[PDB]
Amino acid sequence: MVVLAVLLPVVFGALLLLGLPRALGVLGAGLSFLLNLYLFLTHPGGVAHAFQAPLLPGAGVYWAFGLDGLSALFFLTIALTVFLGALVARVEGRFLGLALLMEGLLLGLFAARDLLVFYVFFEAALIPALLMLYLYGGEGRTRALYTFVLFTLVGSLPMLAAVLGARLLSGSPTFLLEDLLAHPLQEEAAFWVFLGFALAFAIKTPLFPLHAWLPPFHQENHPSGLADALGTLYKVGVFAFFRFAIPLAPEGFAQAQGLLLFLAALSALYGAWVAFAAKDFKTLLAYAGLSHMGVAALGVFSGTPEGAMGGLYLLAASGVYTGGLFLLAGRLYERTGTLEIGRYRGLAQSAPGLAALALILFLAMVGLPGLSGFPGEFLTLLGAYKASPWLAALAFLSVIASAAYALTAFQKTFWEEGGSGVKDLAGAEWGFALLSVLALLLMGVFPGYFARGLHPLAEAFAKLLGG
Amino acid sequence: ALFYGDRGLLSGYFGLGGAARSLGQGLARLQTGYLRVYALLFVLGALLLLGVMR
Amino acid sequence: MTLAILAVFSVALTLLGFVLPPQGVKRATLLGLALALASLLLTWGKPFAFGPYAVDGVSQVFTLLALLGALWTVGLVRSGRFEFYLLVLYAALGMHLLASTRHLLLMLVALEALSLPLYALATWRRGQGLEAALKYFLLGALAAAFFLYGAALFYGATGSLVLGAPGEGPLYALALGLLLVGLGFKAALAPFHFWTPDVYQGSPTPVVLFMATSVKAAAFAALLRVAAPPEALALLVALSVVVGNLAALAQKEAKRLLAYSSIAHAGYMALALYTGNAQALGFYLLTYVLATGLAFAVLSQISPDRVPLEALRGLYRKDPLLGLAFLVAMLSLLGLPPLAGFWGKYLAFAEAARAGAWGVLVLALVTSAVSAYYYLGLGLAVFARPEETPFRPGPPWARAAVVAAGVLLLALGLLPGLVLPALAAGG
Amino acid sequence: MALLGTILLPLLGFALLGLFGKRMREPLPGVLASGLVLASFLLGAGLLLSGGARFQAEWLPGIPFSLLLDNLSGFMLLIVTGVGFLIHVYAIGYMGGDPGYSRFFAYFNLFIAMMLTLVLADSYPVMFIGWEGVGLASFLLIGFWYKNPQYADSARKAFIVNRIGDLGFMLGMAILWALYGTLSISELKEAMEGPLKNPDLLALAGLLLFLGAVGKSAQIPLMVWLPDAMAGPTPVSALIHAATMVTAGVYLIARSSFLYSVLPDVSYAIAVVGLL
């Protein structure tokens, strides 16, 4: 059931860290992909594989797991992305076990059916990231690590008091989200809990004034960008907003909606804009991920089940193609040795199909229709314009700067005058490119098939902001 | 210019960390090592606590 | 009737040391403490009271922890003075009597019985060890005077010197404050914390192990008996956590930084005092005791007199298991999932919020997030390049002990629903 | 469904010429592309002569996938297919000794299929899909011989300006969803006549739609991006300036005639900009 699909990446990461060899982690990630896709099918609903076990009976804590429609496609997204990053990795630092550990942890986190288990995984996922960051590259590694870790922890630890309040002040018997949703928090008490949620989720969303951890984090990781891929998968903030923050304390969110939408719009614009000034790949992609989280936060904060489903779909797909671009940059680094955007211009003539792969990933990035980003982007526009037309309009002076930075980097990196000539493609990169573009096309062309399970949650939790 | 501004924002977060450490060492300099200092601060804190208890 | 075991072993060995070599006295002390621990196990759920001596969950849990720390630190001590063993036994009995009674004056007698050997055990003869011993002795006698006038005013409020009396208004509050002064002093609570860094820094490392396990355990075991009001509790917690973490940032030495960390953790533990749970607090202190004893056994394998922060580094290359255990211990002392430090922290925070004290709790959490600075400057340092540092990589005794302690920390972090169900009467 | 194959063909063709591409002899890409263009012309003339076509497939909730082939759509289809096949043969001739033959004709197939998806549309999202797909193929083909920095910034500026117009389009589409909730030109038109509401908002949606049309057909102020399309190969420049990527703007007004005919100031301004 759900437990096995969640645990498999963790145990395979253990068998990669403590056991040997490197190759078996790739097939472990593949097995995770297969099982998560199977569980994605035949899915009746939330109860799909319900699991209940005691953790702190006296305190009210249970291992609570199951597949939502949201959890299903997020399982699929993570399993696919991590399997791609496992085969093509070339990190080989003997730490891919940490990446599989983080995969399983994020799977359990999305499978969290009770609040405390969500919080537990939210806090536990700090370990892999810091490890694969610290001992696998970077000059200011420890300092950017302290920045990121202190940001997350200062945000998270008061959210523990927030969740204790959400359990106690409502008289909930346990931490189960079902029970906590059955006992809503009252006025002048949901205020503080939602504020604690909004700081901790925004600093990890990330939003504009609190985004300062993302570029230093993404630069100093393993230059292959596996740690960067999984850290980009670590922006799960938006989800916790829609599923946990807003429903559990909508009363304060009613007042804070204007400020949240403002932060989301300004983050999107600022990221997609400053990405132009970025002289390197890690900074550029960090600002891109900030832009995408700004758009997703806009879609969620706007109400408008349209915008909510669009923001979530955009979040999943953006994680996918950003991790793809990180792995692509890591492979071009491994074969060249430098990530500068100016130098090594002729790549396109030497690289036959790596240019087209990078182009497809970039097009999905700037939200070109026919790829997975456009459904969520446009649905978020619609929902935000319903919520606040000004903020959706300003926020969508983004496709311009998006196109600018993406095409500038692609041209100055690949298209221009030939250099020495660089390695063309690796055997693992073959399956990597094939599956990546396959998934992009399938999820962009048929957002009807996917995201159907996202609609009921979105409409119910958006009408919850109504009468 | 906004890249410069983000640089300055991260520098300001660093300034927050530096203010925390500076406050920390100002509180650490409170432990001089003379026993008379320690007993005086002990008695002061105990009086303060007994005053709060009302 | 484990106290009988302790008294018998101590008094017999006192004379037998004249006929027995220090090694034989060491093995006898080990046997006696292990038998007292076993007797505690077989008596789980068998309350036994004679007079003011009253065995409850607190008694059993905290005396088990103290005996654990005593056994561990005896494992390390090999000095050719049987006295350096006898005191351990003595301290054990004393701390036992501290947790197992409600009589205020018997509490004072137990405080003296446990505190006297601890002054002397820190005498490796290094002048700073003597400086620490003198600071410790004078401040402890001051705290004993304060505690005693508190017990006197308590008797002024009621006809008995046993806790559980109804209690009056302002005079009862004053008496309780004058008791809490000395008890928190023993528990490293601010603004009474000044002795802790100097004493932890001056004393030999295994002695600081013994301290940082048994002293804190027994002090909180005595604290739970007091009905401390929440306002004074807020003052102590706020001051302790804030000053502790802040001044710990600026520290350059491992032992002094760790003493500040123990101040911050005592501030955290004092949150259960809002509810007096004594189950959650038993679990918390179990985890903290295990981790800190582990860390200080390793520090003893590094240096008895003093350990700098750089010395901790490179340990994994030196010793793999030791580096792993130090990293795990640092994370658990940070209270991170899925480690038992997180369960203890969560249980204390739940008791505190359930009492409805919000600003204090949030401040403790923000400052605990601040603590990652040095908690990480220690935990991760295991992997750094070894700089010049004396290193004696221990016997298999301490290695296996460290392994068991770390495994138990992480196991109780993952699956607390194993023992925590039995920290009350013990079904 | 047969209507969809007309677009599916210059997708299989593009995939062959892009993925493998240079594994073929020199004349072949033109042969395959011209065959797909001609076999789309034929099956479109056959459908139009048969009265018309309709196709609906499941898509985003509330936003289905609607293809409608009528007189106005088939007119553009026949135009584009005929001129495209003629330029295909002229490119078979004109492209000689130049590598990227397959690149050229794969981009051609993509361009034709996307322009067909654009004009054959009953829903504005599909029109916008075609819009940005045409912008992509144009940016690609202008920089066909990529070794030149001069003929890279041209296409760069082209696609930036294109995306500005497309943002205007997106905002108009969001407006025409907030108001009615249909966003399908057929039902949106059948529901838009009668009780017009918020005439300011209707004129605004028309203003943003016209702004998109200006970027597409390179009107003021977005005028500057078209001349640099000289950088691309000559048959590409013909296809971009004559048959496609410019007719989209006027076709937008032709399909939104129901909207612009009740907007006197908007249509007057459109005439003014055309004159300018």
mmCIF file of C-alpha atoms in Angstrom, chain C residues 180-367:
data_model
loop_
_atom_site.group_PDB
_atom_site.id
_atom_site.type_symbol
_atom_site.label_atom_id
_atom_site.label_comp_id
_atom_site.label_asym_id
_atom_site.label_seq_id
_atom_site.Cartn_x
_atom_site.Cartn_y
_atom_site.Cartn_z
ATOM 1 C CA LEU C 180 13.098 27.104 43.679
ATOM 2 C CA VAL C 181 16.262 29.228 43.896
ATOM 3 C CA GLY C 182 18.455 26.398 45.153
ATOM 4 C CA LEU C 183 16.647 23.666 43.237
ATOM 5 C CA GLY C 184 17.044 25.422 39.881
ATOM 6 C CA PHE C 185 20.629 26.260 40.819
ATOM 7 C CA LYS C 186 21.156 22.504 40.976
ATOM 8 C CA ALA C 187 19.208 22.312 37.680
ATOM 9 C CA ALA C 188 21.311 25.007 35.906
ATOM 10 C CA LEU C 189 18.404 27.468 35.653
ATOM 11 C CA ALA C 190 19.135 31.143 35.096
ATOM 12 C CA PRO C 191 19.701 33.741 36.488
ATOM 13 C CA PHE C 192 21.568 31.271 38.729
ATOM 14 C CA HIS C 193 23.563 29.761 35.879
ATOM 15 C CA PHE C 194 26.926 31.524 36.252
ATOM 16 C CA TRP C 195 28.639 28.614 38.028
ATOM 17 C CA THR C 196 27.879 26.117 35.243
ATOM 18 C CA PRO C 197 30.293 27.284 32.481
ATOM 19 C CA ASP C 198 33.286 27.837 34.774
ATOM 20 C CA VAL C 199 32.724 24.499 36.566
ATOM 21 C CA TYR C 200 32.154 22.497 33.374
ATOM 22 C CA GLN C 201 35.297 24.058 31.856
ATOM 23 C CA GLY C 202 37.620 23.522 34.837
ATOM 24 C CA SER C 203 36.676 19.922 35.826
ATOM 25 C CA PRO C 204 37.870 16.729 34.089
ATOM 26 C CA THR C 205 35.640 15.596 31.247
ATOM 27 C CA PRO C 206 34.218 12.340 32.776
ATOM 28 C CA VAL C 207 33.302 14.306 35.895
ATOM 29 C CA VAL C 208 31.378 16.743 33.653
ATOM 30 C CA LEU C 209 29.706 13.699 32.073
ATOM 31 C CA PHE C 210 28.584 12.523 35.506
ATOM 32 C CA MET C 211 27.382 16.064 36.323
ATOM 33 C CA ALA C 212 25.540 16.758 33.058
ATOM 34 C CA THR C 213 23.647 13.447 33.451
ATOM 35 C CA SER C 214 22.914 12.837 37.134
ATOM 36 C CA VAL C 215 22.933 16.379 38.566
ATOM 37 C CA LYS C 216 20.370 17.657 36.063
ATOM 38 C CA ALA C 217 18.241 14.515 36.336
ATOM 39 C CA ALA C 218 18.074 14.624 40.147
ATOM 40 C CA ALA C 219 17.539 18.406 40.220
ATOM 41 C CA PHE C 220 14.499 18.207 37.956
ATOM 42 C CA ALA C 221 13.282 15.174 39.942
ATOM 43 C CA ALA C 222 13.295 17.414 43.031
ATOM 44 C CA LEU C 223 11.838 20.357 41.045
ATOM 45 C CA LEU C 224 8.691 18.465 39.981
ATOM 46 C CA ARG C 225 7.669 18.146 43.647
ATOM 47 C CA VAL C 226 7.378 21.965 43.859
ATOM 48 C CA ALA C 227 4.156 23.707 42.797
ATOM 49 C CA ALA C 228 6.027 26.590 41.061
ATOM 50 C CA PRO C 229 3.743 29.384 39.825
ATOM 51 C CA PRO C 230 3.797 29.989 36.053
ATOM 52 C CA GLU C 231 5.017 33.629 36.203
ATOM 53 C CA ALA C 232 8.303 32.850 37.973
ATOM 54 C CA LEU C 233 8.560 29.870 35.607
ATOM 55 C CA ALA C 234 8.250 32.207 32.627
ATOM 56 C CA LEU C 235 10.966 34.474 34.057
ATOM 57 C CA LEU C 236 13.371 31.548 34.586
ATOM 58 C CA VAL C 237 12.677 30.026 31.171
ATOM 59 C CA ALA C 238 13.006 33.306 29.239
ATOM 60 C CA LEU C 239 16.216 34.422 30.967
ATOM 61 C CA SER C 240 17.791 30.942 30.797
ATOM 62 C CA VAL C 241 17.095 30.286 27.118
ATOM 63 C CA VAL C 242 17.919 33.798 25.903
ATOM 64 C CA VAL C 243 21.171 34.350 27.802
ATOM 65 C CA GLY C 244 22.252 30.704 27.428
ATOM 66 C CA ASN C 245 21.976 30.537 23.637
ATOM 67 C CA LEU C 246 23.260 34.092 23.062
ATOM 68 C CA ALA C 247 26.354 33.702 25.263
ATOM 69 C CA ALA C 248 26.850 30.177 23.818
ATOM 70 C CA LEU C 249 27.229 31.745 20.357
ATOM 71 C CA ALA C 250 30.370 33.633 21.477
ATOM 72 C CA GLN C 251 32.055 30.678 23.215
ATOM 73 C CA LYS C 252 35.307 29.254 21.813
ATOM 74 C CA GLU C 253 35.592 26.150 24.056
ATOM 75 C CA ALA C 254 33.577 22.931 23.817
ATOM 76 C CA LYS C 255 32.840 22.324 27.504
ATOM 77 C CA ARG C 256 31.805 25.933 28.262
ATOM 78 C CA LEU C 257 29.571 26.017 25.179
ATOM 79 C CA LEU C 258 28.001 22.736 26.315
ATOM 80 C CA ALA C 259 27.393 24.096 29.801
ATOM 81 C CA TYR C 260 25.531 27.003 28.172
ATOM 82 C CA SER C 261 23.629 24.421 26.102
ATOM 83 C CA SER C 262 22.667 22.636 29.329
ATOM 84 C CA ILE C 263 21.387 25.965 30.672
ATOM 85 C CA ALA C 264 19.221 26.364 27.564
ATOM 86 C CA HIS C 265 17.987 22.749 27.887
ATOM 87 C CA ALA C 266 17.142 23.202 31.566
ATOM 88 C CA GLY C 267 15.126 26.221 30.475
ATOM 89 C CA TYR C 268 13.364 23.955 27.970
ATOM 90 C CA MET C 269 12.718 21.188 30.519
ATOM 91 C CA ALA C 270 11.207 23.693 32.956
ATOM 92 C CA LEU C 271 8.223 23.909 30.569
ATOM 93 C CA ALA C 272 6.815 20.575 31.758
ATOM 94 C CA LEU C 273 6.753 22.272 35.195
ATOM 95 C CA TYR C 274 3.746 24.170 33.850
ATOM 96 C CA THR C 275 1.839 20.861 34.031
ATOM 97 C CA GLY C 276 4.250 18.784 36.126
ATOM 98 C CA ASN C 277 3.723 15.899 33.699
ATOM 99 C CA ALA C 278 6.715 13.817 34.941
ATOM 100 C CA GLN C 279 6.134 11.376 32.054
ATOM 101 C CA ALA C 280 7.129 13.664 29.208
ATOM 102 C CA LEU C 281 9.849 15.093 31.437
ATOM 103 C CA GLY C 282 11.129 11.615 32.289
ATOM 104 C CA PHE C 283 11.383 10.838 28.563
ATOM 105 C CA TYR C 284 13.032 14.185 27.687
ATOM 106 C CA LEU C 285 15.628 13.777 30.415
ATOM 107 C CA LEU C 286 16.265 10.178 29.397
ATOM 108 C CA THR C 287 17.181 11.336 25.880
ATOM 109 C CA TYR C 288 19.272 14.318 27.059
ATOM 110 C CA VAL C 289 21.132 12.177 29.620
ATOM 111 C CA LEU C 290 21.962 9.508 27.023
ATOM 112 C CA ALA C 291 23.179 11.997 24.425
ATOM 113 C CA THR C 292 25.254 14.149 26.775
ATOM 114 C CA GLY C 293 26.867 11.187 28.512
ATOM 115 C CA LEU C 294 27.833 9.909 25.064
ATOM 116 C CA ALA C 295 29.312 13.248 24.008
ATOM 117 C CA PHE C 296 31.309 13.625 27.231
ATOM 118 C CA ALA C 297 32.658 10.076 27.103
ATOM 119 C CA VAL C 298 33.982 11.002 23.645
ATOM 120 C CA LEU C 299 35.328 14.326 24.976
ATOM 121 C CA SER C 300 37.065 12.315 27.718
ATOM 122 C CA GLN C 301 38.670 10.169 25.035
ATOM 123 C CA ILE C 302 39.872 13.509 23.572
ATOM 124 C CA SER C 303 40.958 15.519 26.606
ATOM 125 C CA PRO C 304 40.210 15.509 30.340
ATOM 126 C CA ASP C 305 41.471 18.960 31.280
ATOM 127 C CA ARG C 306 39.951 21.011 28.450
ATOM 128 C CA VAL C 307 38.619 20.367 24.932
ATOM 129 C CA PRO C 308 38.632 23.086 22.236
ATOM 130 C CA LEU C 309 36.047 23.192 19.464
ATOM 131 C CA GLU C 310 38.593 22.218 16.793
ATOM 132 C CA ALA C 311 39.353 19.019 18.732
ATOM 133 C CA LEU C 312 35.871 17.669 17.958
ATOM 134 C CA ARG C 313 36.608 17.936 14.241
ATOM 135 C CA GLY C 314 37.950 15.178 12.038
ATOM 136 C CA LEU C 315 36.674 12.584 14.505
ATOM 137 C CA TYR C 316 35.035 10.445 11.800
ATOM 138 C CA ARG C 317 38.390 9.910 10.086
ATOM 139 C CA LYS C 318 39.769 9.201 13.557
ATOM 140 C CA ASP C 319 36.764 7.100 14.649
ATOM 141 C CA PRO C 320 33.727 6.432 12.379
ATOM 142 C CA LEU C 321 31.269 5.304 15.056
ATOM 143 C CA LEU C 322 32.271 8.158 17.370
ATOM 144 C CA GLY C 323 31.720 10.766 14.674
ATOM 145 C CA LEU C 324 28.338 9.335 13.734
ATOM 146 C CA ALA C 325 27.263 9.267 17.382
ATOM 147 C CA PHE C 326 28.411 12.827 18.005
ATOM 148 C CA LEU C 327 26.477 14.044 14.944
ATOM 149 C CA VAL C 328 23.329 12.160 15.983
ATOM 150 C CA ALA C 329 23.697 13.503 19.533
ATOM 151 C CA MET C 330 24.062 17.087 18.345
ATOM 152 C CA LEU C 331 20.901 16.761 16.243
ATOM 153 C CA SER C 332 18.952 15.187 19.112
ATOM 154 C CA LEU C 333 20.066 17.954 21.475
ATOM 155 C CA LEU C 334 18.801 20.334 18.802
ATOM 156 C CA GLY C 335 15.513 18.430 18.982
ATOM 157 C CA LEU C 336 15.244 17.433 15.351
ATOM 158 C CA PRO C 337 13.053 14.728 13.802
ATOM 159 C CA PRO C 338 13.099 11.808 13.791
ATOM 160 C CA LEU C 339 15.221 11.960 16.952
ATOM 161 C CA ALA C 340 14.056 11.590 20.540
ATOM 162 C CA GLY C 341 15.188 15.108 21.358
ATOM 163 C CA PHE C 342 12.294 16.140 19.122
ATOM 164 C CA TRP C 343 9.849 14.013 21.099
ATOM 165 C CA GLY C 344 11.016 15.450 24.405
ATOM 166 C CA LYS C 345 10.899 19.017 23.073
ATOM 167 C CA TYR C 346 7.422 18.424 21.607
ATOM 168 C CA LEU C 347 6.128 16.907 24.856
ATOM 169 C CA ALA C 348 7.419 19.832 26.960
ATOM 170 C CA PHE C 349 6.064 22.382 24.480
ATOM 171 C CA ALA C 350 2.695 20.625 24.480
ATOM 172 C CA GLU C 351 2.502 20.754 28.285
ATOM 173 C CA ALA C 352 3.467 24.472 28.201
ATOM 174 C CA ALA C 353 0.915 25.431 25.517
ATOM 175 C CA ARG C 354 -1.713 23.349 27.328
ATOM 176 C CA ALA C 355 -1.012 25.597 30.310
ATOM 177 C CA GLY C 356 -1.587 28.531 27.926
ATOM 178 C CA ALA C 357 1.795 30.308 28.028
ATOM 179 C CA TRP C 358 2.407 31.395 24.438
ATOM 180 C CA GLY C 359 5.015 34.142 24.227
ATOM 181 C CA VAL C 360 7.466 32.226 26.421
ATOM 182 C CA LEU C 361 7.046 29.065 24.329
ATOM 183 C CA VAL C 362 7.464 30.883 21.031
ATOM 184 C CA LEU C 363 10.581 32.626 22.391
ATOM 185 C CA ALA C 364 12.068 29.289 23.478
ATOM 186 C CA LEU C 365 11.353 27.882 19.994
ATOM 187 C CA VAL C 366 12.906 30.861 18.127
ATOM 188 C CA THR C 367 15.985 30.724 20.363
#
